[model samples]
Target: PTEANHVQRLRQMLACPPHGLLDRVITNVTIIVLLWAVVWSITGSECLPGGNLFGIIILFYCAIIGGKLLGLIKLPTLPPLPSLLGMLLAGFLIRNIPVINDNVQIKHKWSSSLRSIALSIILVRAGLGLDSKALKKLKGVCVRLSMGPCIVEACTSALLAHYLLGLPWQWGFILGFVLGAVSPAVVVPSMLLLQGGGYGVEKGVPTLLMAAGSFDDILAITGFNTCLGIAFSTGSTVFNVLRGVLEVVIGVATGSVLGFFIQYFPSRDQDKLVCKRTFLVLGLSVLAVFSSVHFGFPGSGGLCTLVMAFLAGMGWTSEKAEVEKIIAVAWDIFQPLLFGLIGAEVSIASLRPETVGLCVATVGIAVLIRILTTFLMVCFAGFNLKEKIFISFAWLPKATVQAAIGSVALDTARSHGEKQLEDYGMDVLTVAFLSILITAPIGSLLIGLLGPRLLQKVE
Candidate 1:
């Protein structure tokens, strides 16, 4: 008994302050295991999340918060990119060093669940920050900033998909739509870094850009869905095309209407209740997405989340700034794990050289196409050279919403027993993930490093 007491006292003292790496690792492991078990119990195997997801999320939260609190390692303090990169490298290193593999099916499934939960939370919060009124005020510039580039990328990718990639017509069209995305994950991180650094776009340009880009994803996904349906079910017939368009239109209308009605009783005129109401609606936005999925609609988790968030913001007649702040705070808290979950989902073993090559080629062409198209469209719409470049860079980071879509694609292929498509999906996600991982830092550094050099003033 005396020896046991002595050992316990020694252990407690060792963990008191300036905790060692061993203790930290042990703690992280314990938390992750418990949380993962909870997640597993909630979702079962069929769902995206399982036990491992909770584990990763807990690890991520503890790591970032602890590191920040300790002051031992000062983080970038701006964007989620650094946090994301940190988690990616760390998770990759952990997997390889610890030698985890398919034997641990529970772990892998848990990781997937984490990816889903992290993504949903982050996107839903971001959606709440978008205000149609704010967007309307900046409509003309926002259109020039977003739509022109999106159209350019979509058309350019469409051409490349058919001519260069040799994809079938519908597949080519879907590729174009997929490549048209300007990643919200990238945009959000870039914004955070820029904001911390005290950089450009004074007159609601940042918010406008974000909102327009959010809609741009919606539009691109709509196009992708059209192509997907036509390719798989209907073979590109005129009626099928029209039906696809109607499906998308109805989906958007459903999301918008649900958003509007859900918030109607709370009164849009009340500034004071905005944050509280925003949280309440965001909690239920997933219901809209899942309801659509359940009812056979072309469900858009990100877009619907954004619409609901926008409706919530409409209530903040005076606390618009406060609402924005709330949104930012939520982003700060949830985005790291969200990003970390993204990194964790990318498994190196799933990659195939040919598929990876194709993904690389497509993403490369997509980026070039985005840049060229954005330049042409925005310049033609009368944006200055500086604004045009900024727009292109902003759109280049595509990881935020793309991850969810990529996850779903993999799930679909796996469900259908389509081995080639499953490999293709994983390959595509790996490429997309790397693109985003590199893009955030490089783009931010470029914008930060070269923004002033290229342009007389940053914006």
Candidate 2:
């Protein structure tokens, strides 16, 4: 009888039948107790030594599991939040918890390389997913949207950072690009949801954003490389620009060759050999990123990898679906770890009012300019008033690049053993973290809420 009742209960839960009046009083106290017991045992493990390699591995497990749990949560009337946010918060929570924080310190070497690997996977996925036909259709809007808001935000943020935060112009602009990048991680999934739901299909709103979003990172990274050269080098300005341009040109050229090879080699049936083909692509992706940095191409590896993967994807006809599937599986494993580590890098306790306020102000002013510039760029793109507004608001979120580059300046300065540079790097990271904390969730929620109401939903 007990076993039969258990099977019946499982079916009821699975179906998620509507709650009855008595359901409120039928508290699942034992289940709640079991849940706490599981958490306590996991978080209370003292067997793992503090600040060691194994301890860090255990921390990764905890982070991945915690992030997964958080991602399952759903609230009424809210757009489903990305698992990345949950992963980020999980890391933050683990870092701040008294006992857990005391032990299990995350080492930079482990997190940094893993994050790079994770980033390479996503960028490759991004490149593979781009549709040539969709891109051709929105050529004018894509070009303008990609170039306009990013430049506007970068310049405006630079001005604000210099005047308000007392940063030098060079440093200010560096920070500008850091914050100016749109989180492809956040924007892509949200836009994909809208696209799948058939909202703005007539206007191709989602496709427009996805293509523009990738290019947005490219423009920001290019500008960042230029500013980084000026800030870090003792060379002439013209020489630095020339070097940056050379790095980009070489990176793109090299990636193009790799892309072409991936398309033609292996003859056929690449999909059936999923594991083999997947690792082959990953091996090349890693090399694409590593070779550039290994040979002293300034900030060129990532862009190169992105371009190469994109080119390979465009060339691929039959094997494309297989490639995407493998990449998706890899992403599930690393996505939680990457975002969690990013969150763990920043501590909420460190945010001082003065510093926090200034970061907020700087990001706020820049985003406002971005919104205005975005609207203007799309004004004559045949989008209605509502669609234009949606596009403008959509561009405001900042995550992926901020996480990628937030601590880069700081890390670079620390390596150089310069105190002043280190301090400036801290300022950049602070603003980057602030932007993520503020914009990621809010922008995501706004897009979810505003999308259906503003855009005409198609069948």
Candidate 3:
């Protein structure tokens, strides 16, 4: 109501458009020239936006506009919706609309790698920003939030997929596994916002949510991989459990070494130490992703990256502000790219009318039951009723992993030599896309709106 009053901001912006680059004329003309240049180039020649670089750059800017428009809007009497939601829908429109989508196509690898880098940024940011002591005390509750709910959701969704959607048990579990992971992209940034405002820091509400969200995704990916293995060749579930633990410990070990290294070598006296250390943490996290896959560990890269950042951050008490601000700037640009490419994953042409209704039913029920467990498990603490409610909604976002592995089961089944199996694979993929459309925006919005009111802001 105060800083966000749209009417007051509009008045200020129009009355005096500030000097030096923010001058109203400069910005206005800049946009016009940029748009006009793009339009003529896209329209005048045989080369369309279909080119990898052109299509993505244009799409990225479009999403940036979408986020900015929503980011700036907050009527005197109304609440503000998060800008990331706006970015998401904008990408969806660019993907679904007729003439626009006709020329916009991004290769899978480009979009995939782009989103991975964005996700790594989030994990590193979370690690650096979270309060370490608060995180330690919040550990027991975070474990419940991470492990208990994932199993509940995974089992519930698998059952729903089987009985409601009538998929076989194996295929049903694949959907459940995919649906179990929540999006750190959605939750971490929202928590970071609250952290910035000093809204929920004292009791560590945002820290708890961010930490728990990261762990739950690890479990989801591990379980999903195991389920995928079960679907294909013969694999032992008992051994699968050990492999997951091994992956986690090894990842933690690797990150601990890097984290300890950053804390020491980038000593307090070096020039540009902040920049160098920031690069090392971010660069190392991306490598964690690559080497994890390189050595064939499924989910450890994420945990390793999270731990690495947190540990290095342990020593970065003062410089954290500088590192954090820099990462946030990077987030500003990557945010649009991340959400936009995620939106581009959904193809309006690929969906079938009959299956969608059933898919929605299954997704709706699965999420509802998961929410129920999340709320109940979110109980048993010093937490207030409103805080528990906020926690439940925060648990609902699903984007990163859904985009990543949503089609794995489908792709595997496609090569299984059975038409019926591949059809079910499409069903799994449909459920993945629909879940993103439903939960990410809505869940993020609820978290944003409820955070200030529900959680205490201790300065």
Candidate 4:
């Protein structure tokens, strides 16, 4: 009788319907915990009354509940729109709420840290999904899309920072790199979302976009790190300070070789084994931190990790569909956690009056700069003047990647013994957070509200 009952219960459990409740729950919990953390940190106190852990638990629980409620309203399919845009809407929603805004601003250290961790995880998974063939076929794409645009974007923005912002060369260069590339989290996911909505599949435009953003990420991240070093060794000659550049290049090079080896050996059929291997790659990335410190290179593992991920994608000789399947399954679990963490770590101090003006100005500045450059680039890329404007806003969302860069700058600078970086990072965060906050919703809404009117079918 006991055995029969147990079997029956197991069958019932297996038969339980799948309504995506778990997905909803995770989303809610992550966002709420993030908000709670931001609020708590901004006031220099715990948002949850007890320990930070307690607040995290409560926020996670609350977000789950919130996500369920939202699901009932029929969640809007991302419809190929950018998550950065969604994040921007979220920022607006939170800021306008009288109850929430009274206690917190939008830029805080804890918030930025959360963004970094989230991005790290997301990127790590992205790395694991890579293998060799994809890399070979897409190598040119990555260089053109990632490195090419990054250099162009950085150089262009560097000039603006010098002439318009009047920042020092180092700071301007840092800012240029920070704002150079499109957010991988934003751009990649947004691509997937749109593809799901049918806008992405008419041609390979979505894939092209993803491939470009992936490589662009590597270039932009490396350059940004270099700029940070420049800021720190203020008196060092440019060539002398180029150590940062060399380290990043080395890290990428190392990651590629090892990444290819792993990808080449791993079998797609060994799902469990592949999963374990994926974790190994992640562990190695973290280990690279210690390796850098011990070897006196003092480089970032983040760049190395990207190389690992790219090589993984490139070397995996399995069918593209199979490789994609692995990524899809892995992403289903990690991506939300990554986003949750992002929401959890947002700086809540932008609510202050002094910060408010800076926040507003930063948003304006980022948009104006991007718009001007994007318009020119589009024209140069051969688009008409009219099409250029849409391309401008289409590329304006600055959510996760920008936040991560801010966090990294803060961490690297503080660890390397530069105190001023703390403030500089906060300023940058204010700008980045506001950049996403202002642009994401507006961009999404335009995509939603006027996207049909303006965006023609891209062949």
Highest TM-score: give the candidate number.
3
Give the least accurate 10-residue stretch of model 4, judged by summed lDDT. 80-89
Candidate 3 or 1, higher TM-score: 3
Tally clashing residue pairs in candidate 4. 31
Residue 361, candidate 4: Cα error in Å is 4.8
Tens digit of per-residue lDDT, candidate 4, span 1-459: 699999999889867865488679678656655655676677545454444544444433433333334435553665333333333333344344546544444335554444444555555644544334434554553454344434555566566546654567667666666666565565455455555555534443344444444444445645554555466663444554465566656666776677656757776577576556655666676666457746644345666776776666566544433445555665543434334445544555552446465335433545565556545543234445544454454565555556455556666666777667766665556555554444443454454423344444555
In model 2, the Cα lDDT at residue 236 comes to: 71
* Predicted model with the maximum lDDT: 3
Candidate 2's clash total is 0
Candidate 1 collision pairs: 36-51, 49-113, 52-110, 53-110, 128-309, 183-398
- Over 4 Å off, model 2: 1-47, 51-53, 68-78, 97-99, 169-171, 200-204, 214-236, 269-275, 351-355, 410-423, 455-458
Per-structure clash totals for the candidates: 6, 0, 0, 31
Worst 10 residues of 3 by lDDT: 44-53
Q: Which stretches of candidate 4 lie over 4 Å from their true place?
A: 1-48, 62-117, 124-171, 174-178, 197-203, 214-240, 267-307, 314-365, 371-394, 405-429, 440-459
Query: For candidate 3, lDDT tens digit of each residue in 40-64?
Result: 5876532345556557777787888
- The C-alpha TM-scores of every prediction are 0.68, 0.78, 0.87, 0.61
RMSD of 1: 7.9
lDDT to native, each model = 0.55, 0.69, 0.75, 0.52
Model 1, 246-332: lDDT tens digits are 545655565676646655666656666766765666566656556655654433555666666666556443554565666567656
Question: Which of the two candidates, 1 or 4, achieves a greater lDDT against the reference?
Answer: 1
